[PDB]
Design a protein around this ligand. Sequence first.
Ligand SMILES: CCCCCCCC/C=C\CCCCCCCC(=O)O[C@@H](COC(=O)CCCCCCCCCCCCCCC)COP(=O)([O-])OCC[N+](C)(C)C
Ligand SMILES: [Mn+2]
Lengths: 678, 611, 102, 102, 101
Amino acid sequence: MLFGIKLANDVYPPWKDSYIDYERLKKLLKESVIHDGRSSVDSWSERNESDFVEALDKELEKVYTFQISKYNAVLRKLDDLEENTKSAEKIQKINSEQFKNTLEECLDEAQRLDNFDRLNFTGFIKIVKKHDKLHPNYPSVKSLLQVRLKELPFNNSEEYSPLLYRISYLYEFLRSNYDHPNTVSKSLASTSKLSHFSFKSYKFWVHDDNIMEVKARILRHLPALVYASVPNENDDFVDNLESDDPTITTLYFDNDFFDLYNNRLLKISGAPTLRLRWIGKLLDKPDIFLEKRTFTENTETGNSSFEEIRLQMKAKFINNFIFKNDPSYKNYLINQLRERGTQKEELEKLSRDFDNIQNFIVEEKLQPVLRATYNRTAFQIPGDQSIRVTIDSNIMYIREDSLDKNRPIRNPENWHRDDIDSNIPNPLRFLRAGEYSKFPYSVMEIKVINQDNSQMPNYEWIKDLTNSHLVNEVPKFSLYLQGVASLFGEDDKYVNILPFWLPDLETDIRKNPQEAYEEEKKTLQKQKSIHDKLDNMRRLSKIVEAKVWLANERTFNRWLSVTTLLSVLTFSIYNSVQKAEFPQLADLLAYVYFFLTLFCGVWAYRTYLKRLTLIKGRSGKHLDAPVGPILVAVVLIVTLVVNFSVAFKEAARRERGLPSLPRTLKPIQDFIFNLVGE
Amino acid sequence: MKFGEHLSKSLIRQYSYYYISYDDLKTELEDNLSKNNGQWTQELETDFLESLEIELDKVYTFCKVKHSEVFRRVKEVQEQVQHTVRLLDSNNPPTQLDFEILEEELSDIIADVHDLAKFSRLNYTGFQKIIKKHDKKTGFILKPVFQVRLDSKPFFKENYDELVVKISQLYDIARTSGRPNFVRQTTKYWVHPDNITELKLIILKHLPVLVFNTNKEFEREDSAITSIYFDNENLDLYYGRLRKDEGAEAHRLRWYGGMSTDTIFVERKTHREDWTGEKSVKARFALKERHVNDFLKGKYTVDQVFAKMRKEGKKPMNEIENLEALASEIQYVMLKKKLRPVVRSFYNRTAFQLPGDARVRISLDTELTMVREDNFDGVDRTHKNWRRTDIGVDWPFKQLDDKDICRFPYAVLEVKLQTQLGQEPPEWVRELVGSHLVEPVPKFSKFIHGVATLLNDKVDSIPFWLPQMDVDIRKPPLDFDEDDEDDAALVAAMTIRAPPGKTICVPVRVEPKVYFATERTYLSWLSISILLGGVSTTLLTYGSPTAMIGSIGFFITSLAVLIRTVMVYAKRVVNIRLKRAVDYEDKIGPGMVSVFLILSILFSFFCNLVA
Amino acid sequence: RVEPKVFFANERTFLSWLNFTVMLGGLGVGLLNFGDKIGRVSAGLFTFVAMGTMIYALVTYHWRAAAIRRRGSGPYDDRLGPTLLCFFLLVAVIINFILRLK
Amino acid sequence: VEPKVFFANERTFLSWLNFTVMLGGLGVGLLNFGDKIGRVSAGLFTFVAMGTMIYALVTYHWRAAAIRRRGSGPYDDRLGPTLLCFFLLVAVIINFILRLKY
Amino acid sequence: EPKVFFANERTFLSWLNFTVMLGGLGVGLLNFGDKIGRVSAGLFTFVAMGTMIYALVTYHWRAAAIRRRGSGPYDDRLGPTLLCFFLLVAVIINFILRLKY
Ligand SMILES: CCCCCCCC/C=C\CCCCCCCC(=O)O[C@@H](COC(=O)CCCCCCCCCCCCCCC)COP(=O)([O-])OCC[N+](C)(C)C
Ligand SMILES: [Mn+2]
C-alpha cells in the first residue's frame, strides 16, 4: 500500500504522538503545487524554507529523543539482571520467574523499538529526498538527518541490535546452569542463534583510489582467476604445429507489492530471489541462466545455509515459460537431454527444478523489474573451498519494469527491454534521466568457511584488512536491495521500507590511517572485553648448425681424395702400356678407370651441391645418396673380375704351341686353366 | 625458505639488485635489538626510517623509469602498426617479416608489463612484511606513519591491465590483417597424489588460474574432458603410434564438460619427422551430437556439415574449402579402415598461464581413467552408439566391472615453454622440473597406455613404462672439431624386462651427423681395396707367369673386402632409413683383413721362393 | 686462452692437403723419370697441379695460424679450395687423356 | 649407444692399416720385380709391415672394452709407435748402404 | 687431459702416414732408378726421414710437456715451411737434372 497508509496502520497505540508527521511535512513542502501545474505562480521563498527546516528540526528532535529515552530505559533494566550474575554469591539468591518475565518484556520492547526506528527512518529519508529533488538552488537538508542519526547510542545498520545479543546470552546462562526446567518460554529461544559458542560473509565498499592496494593485499594470499571461454564451432583449424573481462548482466524478478524485497529486507528465513543471468550482448546468443537463490537457517548455532536452483534457458522459450505458463520447454528439454544420453537421476532433478521454479513464478506473480550490469574479479585457490574473495565494479542499474499501465517502460508481453538491446552501437544514449543509476563504489565480498565448531573463523589477514582505511564495512549489503532503493525508492506507491545504509552513500567514505588505527584499537578492546566477560561468567561461575656444414665439407674432401687416387692409378697404368705382357688388355683398364674417375668427380660435386641445398633452409627427409657408393664398387668388382678372367684366359693360349713354372706349382695352374676353360 | 631467497628467483637477474633489502633490514633490526637488549632508541628508529626511505626511493625511481619505457614502446609500436595498416592497401606490403617482428615486439612488451607488475606487487608485500615485523618486535608503532610515506610515493597503484588489453587488441589486429626467434619445448611428468597440493601451491605463485565459468566459480563438471579414440580390429593405429611411423594418425572425438554438451570436436593428430626433428601437426573441426553417428557412416555428407559457415560468410572461403578437405579425408579413412571406438580417457584439467603471454604454460591432469569401449571380447558395450551411455562424467565410475576400467594412480603434469633465443628459461620452472615432486616420463601417452593396459591379451608390443607401474616414485628432498668431439667421447667412455610374449617397443632416433659418418667410413674402406686391387693388376699384366698365383690371392682378398664393405654400408643405410636399431661396432673387419693379408703375403713369398 | 686442440686440427688439415699434393707429385715424378716426351708433358702438368695445391695449402695454413693467434674463432669454413682442386683435377685428367689419345 | 666412440675406434684402426697396406704393396713390388737387392729388402720391409699390422690389431681389440672392464686410463703408449718408428729408418739406412755397394 | 694426449697421438699418426708414403715412394724410385734417379730418390727419402724425425721429436716433447702443464710446442711455424722448402727444392733439382741430360 501507500507509505501513509502503512504508517497509519502500524502506529503503536501507546505511541501515537512520537511518530513522524509525514502528511503535514508533505503539505508544508507544497508538493501539491508541484503535482498540479496550472497555478505554479507561488514559488519557493525563504520564509517557506525557514518554516520547513523548523518543522523538520522539531520532528527529528521529538522522534530521536523518544528513541534515545526508550533505548536508555531498556539497557538499564537488563543491567540489573546482570548484577544478580557477576557475584558467584548473588547467584544462589536468584529467582527464575521474575528474570524470565523481565527478559520477555525486554524482548518485546526491543522488537517494538526496532519497528519504530524502521518506520521513522523510512519517513525521514523519503521527506529529505523529496525536498532535495525539488528546489535545487537552496542547500540540501540532509545534514540535519545525518547529525540526528550520528547522535544515536548505537550504530545504524542492518546488524542485530546489541540488546538482542545481551538478552540472548543472559537467557543462555539462565537456562544453562541455574534451572534447566521451568523455562517454558519458546520465543526467547529464537535469539539462541545469537549466543556465542560455518559460513560467514563480509561485505565492503571500496573507493576507486584504493582498489589497487586491496588487490595487492589479496593477491599476497590468493591467486587470480582468469576467465577462459570453452571452445565452440568457430575454433576449427586445418594444420598447425604442436603447441602452436566480460560484462555480467542480471535481470531481477519481483511483483507489484515488492514482496521479495520486503521479505529480504526483514531477514525472514527462507526468502528467495529470482533472476536471469548472462554475459556480453544478447545478440551474440549467449547462455542464459535462471537462478532461484534462498538463504535458510535451521540450527541453534546460527549458521545459515544457501540453496540455489539453476536452469538453462533458450531466448525463444522464455516468454511462454514465464508469462503463459507453457510447459512445452520442460518436455522439449527433457526429451533432448534424454536423447543426448543423460542418466535418469539428473532428469528427475531437472524435472523437479522446472516444477519448483514454474510454480514459484505462477503463484507469486513475479515479473522482471530491474537490470544490473557489472564486472567481476575473483580470488580463490583451486580445490579449496575454505576462502573466497570477489569484487564487483562498474555497477549500473536500469529500470526494466512494466508498472506504468499507460506508458510501460518494457512491454508487458516481452521478457526484456527492446530499445536497450538494439543493433545501434551505443544504445545507452536513448536512456532518459531518472531511468538509470550508477553505483559509485566497488563491492567486495569475503566468504570464509569454518566447518568445525572452531568458535568463528577469526583468521589473520582478513581481520587485518577489515580494520583498515581502505574498506568501509556494510553488513548485509545486497545489490538487489540497493538497486530497488535507487530506482524505486522515491515512490510511495511501491517502496514502503528502506535500508539503513542509504545515508552513508553521500558521505566521503575515505579514511585516514590514524583514524583507522584508533577505531581498530577501540574495536579490539571492545571484543577483548566481551570475550573476557563471557569466559569469566561462563565456566568460572558455572555450577646455425655449422657441424653439418663441416661434415659436408669433410665428405667432399674424402670424395676428392678417392678421385685423386683413382686418377693416379689410371694414368700409371695407361702410360706404361707398351711394357705390358698383354698390351691389348691394358688399353681397356685405363679407359674404364678414366670413366670411373670422371664419374667420381661428377658425383662428388653433384651430391655436395644437393646436400648443400638441403642444409640451407630446413627440408629433406634424409641426408644420403647411396647410388654412387654402390655403382662405384660394382664397377670396380666388374673391372677386376674381367681383368682376372681375360688375363688367365690368354695365359693359356700363349703357352700352347710355343720351363717357366716350378714343378710344385704345376698342378695349381691346371686347376685355374680348368676353371677358365683353357 | 627466506623471503629474500624467494625474491631472488622470482624474476630474471636484470630485475634483481633493485628489490627491497628485506634480509639486510631484518638482520640490522635483530642485531641492534640484541646489542641493546631491547629498549629501542629513537636514533635507531631514525636510522631504520632513513634506510626504509632510501630503499623506497630506489624502488620508486626504478618503477617510474620502467613505466616510462613501457609506455613509450607501446606508443611507438602502435604508431608503427597504424602506419603498416595504412600501407597495407599500397603496393608491395610485406607480410612474412614485418608482421613477425611486430608480433615479437608485442610479445616482448607484454612480458615486460607482466614482470613489472609482479615486481611492484612483490616489493609492496616486502615493505608490509618488514613494517609489520618491526611493529611486532619493537614496542614503538610505525605502520600509520609509514603508510603516509608509502602513499606519497605510489609505485604500486599503477594499473597495467589496460596496457595488456591494448597490446592484445593490437596483436589481434595484426593477426587479422596478417593472413593473406624462439624455441618450443614440451615435457610430461608423473606426480604422486601426496605431492599434488604442494606442487599446485608452488605453481600458483607465478601464474594465475583459468576458469571456464561465467561467474568465475569452480564447479565439478566445468573441467572434465572426455575423448573417444578410434581403431580397427587389428589395432593398426595403436602400432602406428607406438612405432612412430611417418604419417601415423590418431583419430578421436572430444568434448568438454558433462553429458549436456552438444558440440563434439573431431580431431586428427599426424606425426611427421625430418632430420631436424618432430614436426607434428593437429587438425580438428566441430560437429553436433545428433549428427555424429551419421557422420561415422557417410550418411551425413560434408556439404551439410559446413552449410552454416558458408551461409553466414564470416569465414573466408579458402579456409572453408580446407576444412571440407580435412573432413572428407577423415570420413574416407574412417570408412576404408573400418575404425570403431576402442577406448575412452577421462580426466580433470587445470590450466596455468598468463593473459597474452606464451613463455610458460602448465597443465595438470587428475583423476585419469581409461574405460574400455570395444566389442572384441564378445560383449557389445556401446549398442551401435559412438559412446557407451551407461557412464558419464561421474568419477569414480563404480558401476563398471573391474575388467573394463583402469585407474591411473598418479597425476600428469605438462610443461610447455616458448623461450626466446639468447636467454634461459625462468629459474622457478627449472627448479620445479628438477625436484622431488615430479618424475619425468618422456613421450608418455594416454591412448597407448589405455590400449596396452586394457587389451593386454591382444597386443605384442608394449611401452617402456608399463612394466614399471609398481615402482614407488616418491623421492626425498634434495666451433668444436668433430674429431675432437669423438676423441672426447672416447676418453669419457673409456674411463626391467617385458613379460613373456611381449617386447618393449622403443623407436630409435639418430643424430643427423651420422649420415655423413657411415659414408666416410665406407670411403675409408674403399680406397684400401683400390690399393689392394692395384697390386692385383700390376701382377696380372706386368709379372712373370710364375707370380700370378699371388695375383689370384690378392684378387680374392680385394673382392672379399670390397663386397663386405658394400654389404655393411647397404645394411646400415637400409636400417637407418626404416628406424631400426643398429650395431655400430664391427668386430669382424680387422680380423678378416688381418688373416687375409697375412695369408696372401706368406703365400706370395712361398710361391716366389719355391724350387 | 688458446688450446692445443685447434692447432692440432689445423695441422691435421695441413697434412691432409699435403697428402693430396704428395700423391699428385709422386705421379708427376714417376711420369717424369720414365716414359717419352708425352709422359714428360703429362708429368710437368701434374707437378704444376701438385705445386699449386701445395702452395694453396701452405697459404691457408699460415692464414689459419694467424687467425688463431689473434684470438677469435675462424678455422671452420673453407669452400673455395675444394672446388678449385676438383676443377683443376678434372681439367688435368681430361687434358692428359686427350693428349695421350692423339 | 654413442656411435662416435665406435667410429673413432674404426678411424684409428684404418689409419694404422694404411701403413701396413702401403708397406705390403711396396714389399710385393720389390720382391716380384727387381734384382737381388729388391728381394733382400722385401722381407726386411714386410717384417715391419707385419709388426705394424699386428700392433694395430692388438691396439684395436684392446680398445674394444668400452662396454665392460672399464677402468683403463689414458693409453700413453709411447713405446709402441716409437719402437716401430725406428725399424723403418733402420731398413732405409740398410737399403742405402747395401745399394751403394753395387 | 687424456683427450689432448689422444689428439697428439692423432697428429703423430697423420705425420707417420705422410712420412711413410713419402719414404715408400722414395725407396720405390731408388730401387728402379739410374744415377740421376738414385740421387733424387736419396734426396726425397732424406727429406722424408728428416720430417719423420722432427715429427717424432715434436710428439715426444708434446706428450711429456702436458703432464708438466708448462709451455709446450703447440704453436709451430718452421716444420711446414721447411717441409715445403725441401719438397720444392727436391722437385726443382730432379726436374733440372732430368732435363739437363
Ligand atoms: C712430391 C712427391 C715426390 C715423389 C717422388 C717418388 C716417385 C716414385 C716414382 C715411381 C715409383 C716406382 C716406379 C718404378 C717402375 C718400374 C717398372 C716399370 O714398368 O717402369 C717402366 C715405366 O714405368 C712407368 O711409367 C710407371 C709409372 C709409375 C707411377 C707411380 C707408381 C707408384 C705408386 C703410386 C700409387 C699411389 C701412391 C700410394 C702409396 C703407394 C719403365 O719404362 P722404360 O721406358 O723402360 O724406362 C725408362 C728407360 N729409358 C728412359 C732409358 C727409356
Ligand atoms: Mn597433452
